[PDB]
Amino acid sequence: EDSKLSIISWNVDGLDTLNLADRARGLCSYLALYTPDVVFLQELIPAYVQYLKKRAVSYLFFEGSDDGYFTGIMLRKSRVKFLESEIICFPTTQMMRNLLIAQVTFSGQKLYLMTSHLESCKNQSQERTKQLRVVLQKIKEAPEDAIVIFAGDTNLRDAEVANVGGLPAGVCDVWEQLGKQEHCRYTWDTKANSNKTVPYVSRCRFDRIFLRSAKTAPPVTPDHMALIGMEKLDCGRYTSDHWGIYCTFNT
Amino acid sequence: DSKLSIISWNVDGLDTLNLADRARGLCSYLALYTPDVVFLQELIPAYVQYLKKRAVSYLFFEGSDDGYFTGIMLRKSRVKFLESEIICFPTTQMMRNLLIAQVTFSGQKLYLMTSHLESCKNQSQERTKQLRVVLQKIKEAPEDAIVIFAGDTNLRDAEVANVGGLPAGVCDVWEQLGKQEHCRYTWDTKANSNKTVPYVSRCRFDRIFLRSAKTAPPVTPDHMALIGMEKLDCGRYTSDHWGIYCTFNT
DNA sequence: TGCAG
Ligand SMILES: [Mg+2]
């Protein structure tokens, strides 16, 4: 339906150079299939984002850096009006992580769109938790008339959100709100996804979407979510070692 | 014993306190473990001078001729040498490089490699550029060789994930052996008092990467232990690092 | 040549 917002969030694994060009074409095929209004990307590198800017011309692009690897937000120009953007630094990151924000108008409503790729690996629980607190604070404090959508690769694992006292009042995790469905829970699954070779099997819900409605208007609900990218491409590999999330909202 | 054995150890040659007593310590380990290959980091000329005098069962290759540098020792009775080379790391600020010795071990070609990757927490950028060079050389090594890289990589787990992980066919031996808790940390300021610091840091800097030969059945690691975790007569440890002893099913 | 849980 028309006023329904659609998004894709995906860590595209730009740090994996193997078949990277073919995999960027694969990403583009999913974007053409799903025509999302907003795309939140992690682990872009300059060659990858240059390619997307050549192909996905119906989108406006914002990046979290100009070199190394970084996040991106793409906004569908026919659907989403860009207002302003900013980058918030993570003071103690060892991995150049940060918080990229874009404020936009959509369906007569202000949206505050955010993405990050939180500090990586089990052993970085402490720094990752520090960054999570910064993200949740920015969600809470965002302009009262805006719907806030954070979507990114949080690297979060069991009990790390519980250990900060859970999500604050007014903020939900979309996968939780849609019923905690096993069918679309794990976004990183090394048994199912053969892109990285690993000594031990694991399944984690690293990619997450957090939603806050406007404080001054009726709340909106998520509609549906699905994991995407579970097809192999012509080159015999998946688009990424992560599955993407496609999600719609009742805006 | 058909099993190949190695020791890898950063000897901390930049710490000159009790250096002769500590080299004697290392030699005691070599006499006990009689490894087929020793991969050493942070040798200095005084140190390697001592080792060459004592460890007469070994053929020595050194990664430089002054300052501090790496070395590979080959047990002459077990390993036949073929050729060696040094790959330069163009943007190192610490004279780091990749030292490679190709050898045969009862007829099976081994491609032996060591490096001391750029030091310090804040050098992740140059360290990971060097790691990429290492992993590329392991991937491209001759199909008929078993590859063993062992060195002081100064790596943090995320730095490896952040280059895309280890390439297919390449494993980290400690991971492959089950991520065992008591042979995990190789630089541990709580357990090792040679460095006087007021904080606790426990790091897995010393690592071994293994690739099989296509021309032979796959190689698995057999057993690993951390060594050097006892004080010498002088009241210091052999190094601020623990050494790694490891065997392979070859 | 500054952890992990
Ligand atoms: Mg040192």
Say whether B17 sits in a helix, a strand or coil: coil
Is B156 close to A18, i.e. CB distance below 8 A?
Answer: no
- The answer to whether A126 CB is within 7 Å of strand C is yes
| C-alpha A210, offset from chain centre | 10
Contact between B100 and B84 under an 8 Å Cβ cutoff? The reply is: yes
Q: Is B93 on the interface with A (CB under 8 A)?
A: no
> Which residues in chain B have their CB less than 8 angstroms from residue A18's CB?
164
Say whether B68 sits in a helix, a strand or coil: coil
Question: What CA–CA distances, in Å, run from A78 to A3, A38, A39?
Answer: 13, 11, 14
- Phi, psi angle pair for B138, to nearest 5°: -65, -45
Q: Quote the CA–CA distance of A169 and B69 in Å, as a whole number.
A: 57
Break positions in chain B: residue before each gap, C to N over 2.5 angstroms:
none
Q: Quote the CA–CA distance of B120 and B240 in Å, as a whole number.
A: 15
* Nucleotide in closest CA–C1' contact with B206: C1
Contact between A87 and A101 under an 8 Å Cβ cutoff? The reply is: yes
Contact between B220 and B175 under an 8 Å Cβ cutoff? The reply is: no
Virtual torsion, Cα A238, A239, A243, A249, nearest 10 deg? -140
Say whether B31 sits in a helix, a strand or coil: helix
The order of strands in the sheet holding A207-212 is A81-89, A98-106, A109-115, A146-153, A207-212, A171-173
For chain A, the domain total comes to 1
Among A198, A182, A180, A178, smallest CA distance to A190 is for A198
Which DSSP helix (H) or strand (E) runs through B26? Answer: helix B19-33
* Crossing angle of the two packed helices B19-33 and B45-54, in degrees rounded to 10: 40
Q: Quote the CA–CA distance of A120 and A97 in Å, as a whole number.
A: 9
φ/ψ region of A81 (left if φ > 0, alpha if ψ in -120 to 50, else beta) reads beta
Which residues in B198-237 are b (16+ Cβ under 10 Å) and which e?
eeeeebbbbbbbbbbbeeeeebebeebbbbbeeebeeebb
Q: Please list the residues that pair with B63 across neighbouring strands.
A: none
Q: Please list the residues that pair with A70 across neighbouring strands.
A: A44
**What residues of B act catalytically?**
152
* Tokens describing residue A216: 């001054």
The order of strands in the sheet holding A5-11 is A59-63, A70-76, A38-44, A5-11, A244-249, A222-228
Cβ-Cβ contacts under 8 Å for A143 (sequence gap 6 or more): A103, A110, A112
Cβ-Cβ contacts under 8 Å for A101 (sequence gap 6 or more): A85, A86, A87, A88, A112, A113, A114, A138
Is B158 close to A123, i.e. CB distance below 8 A?
Answer: yes
Which DSSP helix (H) or strand (E) runs through A63? Answer: strand A59-63
Query: Residue A189's domain is classified under what CATH number?
Result: 3.60.10.10
Which technique was used to obtain these atomic coordinates?
Answer: X-ray
> Which range of residues forms the domain containing residue A183?
1-251
- In chain A, what are the helix, strand and coil shares in percent, each to the nearest 5? 20, 35, 45
Q: Quote the CA–CA distance of A85 and A185 in Å, as a whole number.
A: 30
* Tokens describing residue A241: 């070692």
